[PDB]
Design a binder for this molecule. Sequence first.
Ligand SMILES: O=c1ccn([C@@H]2O[C@H](COP(=O)(O)OP(=O)(O)O)[C@@H](O)[C@H]2O)c(=O)[nH]1
Ligand SMILES: O=c1ccn([C@@H]2O[C@H](COP(=O)(O)OP(=O)(O)O)[C@@H](O)[C@H]2O)c(=O)[nH]1
Ligand SMILES: Nc1ncnc2c1ncn2[C@@H]1O[C@H](COP(=O)(O)O)[C@@H](O)[C@H]1O
Ligand SMILES: Nc1ncnc2c1ncn2[C@@H]1O[C@H](COP(=O)(O)O)[C@@H](O)[C@H]1O
Ligand SMILES: [Cl-]
Ligand SMILES: [Cl-]
Ligand SMILES: [Cl-]
Ligand SMILES: [Cl-]
Lengths: 330, 330
Amino acid sequence: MDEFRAYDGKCVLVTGGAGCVGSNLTGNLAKAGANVIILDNLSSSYEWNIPEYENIEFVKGDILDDEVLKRVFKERPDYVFHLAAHFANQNSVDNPEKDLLVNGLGILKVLEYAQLVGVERFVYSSSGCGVYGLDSKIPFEEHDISISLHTPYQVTKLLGELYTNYFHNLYEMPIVNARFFNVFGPGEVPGKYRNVIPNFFYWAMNQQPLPITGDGSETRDWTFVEDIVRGLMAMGVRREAIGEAINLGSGTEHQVIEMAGIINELTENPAGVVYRPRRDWDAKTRLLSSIDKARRLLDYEPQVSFREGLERTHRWFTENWELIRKSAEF
Amino acid sequence: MDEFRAYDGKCVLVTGGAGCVGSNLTGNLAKAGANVIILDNLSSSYEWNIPEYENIEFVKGDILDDEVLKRVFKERPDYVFHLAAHFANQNSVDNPEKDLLVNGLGILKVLEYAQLVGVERFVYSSSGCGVYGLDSKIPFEEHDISISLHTPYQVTKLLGELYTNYFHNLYEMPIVNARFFNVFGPGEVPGKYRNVIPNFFYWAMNQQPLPITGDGSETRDWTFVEDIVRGLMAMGVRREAIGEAINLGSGTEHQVIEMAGIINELTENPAGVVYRPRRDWDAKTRLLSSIDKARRLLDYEPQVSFREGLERTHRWFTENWELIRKSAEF
Ligand SMILES: O=c1ccn([C@@H]2O[C@H](COP(=O)(O)OP(=O)(O)O)[C@@H](O)[C@H]2O)c(=O)[nH]1
Ligand SMILES: O=c1ccn([C@@H]2O[C@H](COP(=O)(O)OP(=O)(O)O)[C@@H](O)[C@H]2O)c(=O)[nH]1
Ligand SMILES: Nc1ncnc2c1ncn2[C@@H]1O[C@H](COP(=O)(O)O)[C@@H](O)[C@H]1O
Ligand SMILES: Nc1ncnc2c1ncn2[C@@H]1O[C@H](COP(=O)(O)O)[C@@H](O)[C@H]1O
Ligand SMILES: [Cl-]
Ligand SMILES: [Cl-]
Ligand SMILES: [Cl-]
Ligand SMILES: [Cl-]
């Protein structure tokens, strides 16, 4: 609160700033007095998702385009939050080159420009799916990484860390690698390549059965977007985060069948659940992070329960239902 | 010997097959009866470097070009040795995007085509510089990797492993990741971005002082090219190599000043040595691999001593001196 007043009067660039995390993040930066610039190509998000503040400048463009990168970086951002990404697992399996260009060459370009102007922090949204392998012990600790991965998204999420660490090591760029665990909340529009919670909300609110890809006992560590954002904002300002990879998760597990049940309950869906095979790239029956490093370095602590998070997500759906129906990416 | 007769009558694609490793490798495959196809854009090598055998087809082209990839992959290779790379540390620091396209997108394309036709083995030339970090214990063991790297080449060398493991994990591609340690021998032309041994030969044979970037006590594990090739050829056929990363090195250390001394002695250079600062990306005062996994899995054993290797390298230089002078990349 008093912490985040280091953003007041600062120029902050959020690539991917119109998505779920970005929209919530830009809103909070704007409240803290930052002059926020969003760069987003609207490939998975919509302009309507951006919160309306005088001190948010929205720039439609691509991180692969050197023209628009010069346009935003000539503003000389003090902070870059790099949230632009080709999302996610299936999308990357389907389109692995595109995935590499966006997540590999895209971050590299953004880093190169960041080096040219100098930044106080470069905070990259990495992934807990992209680094903890079948041999990593649950709950996942940041040192315990694998290079044996199951999708090109996992590959390129780790690649982004390879690049931020490089720029830290050779050029002393103050980077932070935030390993997000299954983010959910207001601001993720549903669609073919999107996450399960918004799709389950969307299907349940059309009274369709929720398709479970597995037996339902698979777990995730679902982290509410507002928790993620408080994590990110601490990462921008705490010296101790510099050069570190840090999990941002809830630190608790929930079963897919529980999550489906809550969503059916909240939406008064009568159609229940149907079972489908496990997706072939999905080797993870469990994901669970250890958030002790984030507590230590950032005084991070999740504040929003799984249930409260689902309820908030539901409210977002009901309040923007027709817009979500127009916008859904199936 | 009896081992390598599994290559007889087989189609083998060697990307980067005109370089130092590739030229030596293609020659040996040709002797074993393989129908060898080289794909090489001649960016750091020359056509004169390719050994003359009836059963080597040379295709000038780039791994980034989908047309030429269709041309070679329609031959349906049983084996791919992927040696095409953007080389190396300084080159990558200077040209990091180019580096990513060649080492990241290039390997990804080659892997995608390999998946389309099916291969018996996909052997990738990774690097011992690209994966063992400042915290990795010497002698370097294959599990003991870092994601904190010092050049984009190191980054993209590891990226190639990320991709081969992916294709192994999702699509059961029989891959092998060969982590080469400072290769040297006949077939590396000297130049601005090239390795120290050929440049030291070139400078010494022009009676110029050998520039040492450091104090001279820094060590490498220099591995003679013919040893590397015997490693690669075992990797193509041994079931036990499938899915593995395996160091190919000498397993011994030599100081830079020793190496300079030998080269000055061999070339009768009178100009001695001069000292220059450590290159800023070069955090490695020592590199030394553990080759116990290669012994175990491939019955690999270096046969050529450092000294014998330097003498052979020298012979190559004297025998092709004028061609090397025309060809040098400074
Ligand atoms: O339509 C779907 C999509 C996902 N899942 C399950 O929900 C969890 C999270 O899936 P998501 O695609 O949101 O994230 P990821 O698998 O990438 O963590 C996984 O255990 C899936 O098996 C599901 O049951 N039905
Ligand atoms: O012109 C040079 C180039 C390299 N080296 C040294 O020789 C070793 C190997 O350098 P090279 O560039 O061949 O390989 P790498 O550093 O990538 O292992 C290193 O310890 C360098 O400091 C040197 O003394 N002079
Ligand atoms: N190449 C790109 N350039 C700029 N923005 C992008 C690019 N790719 C994806 N995005 C955006 O980045 C955000 C990523 O959020 P998500 O889709 O949750 O991963 C979305 O708002 C996308 O529209
Ligand atoms: N993009 C590329 N496509 C095809 N061959 C390449 C490419 N980049 C480099 N090469 C070749 O790959 C070999 C790599 O050997 P080296 O230069 O020792 O790393 C050389 O013969 C190069 O000419
Ligand atoms: Cl592992
Ligand atoms: Cl601080
Ligand atoms: Cl490390
Ligand atoms: Cl065997």
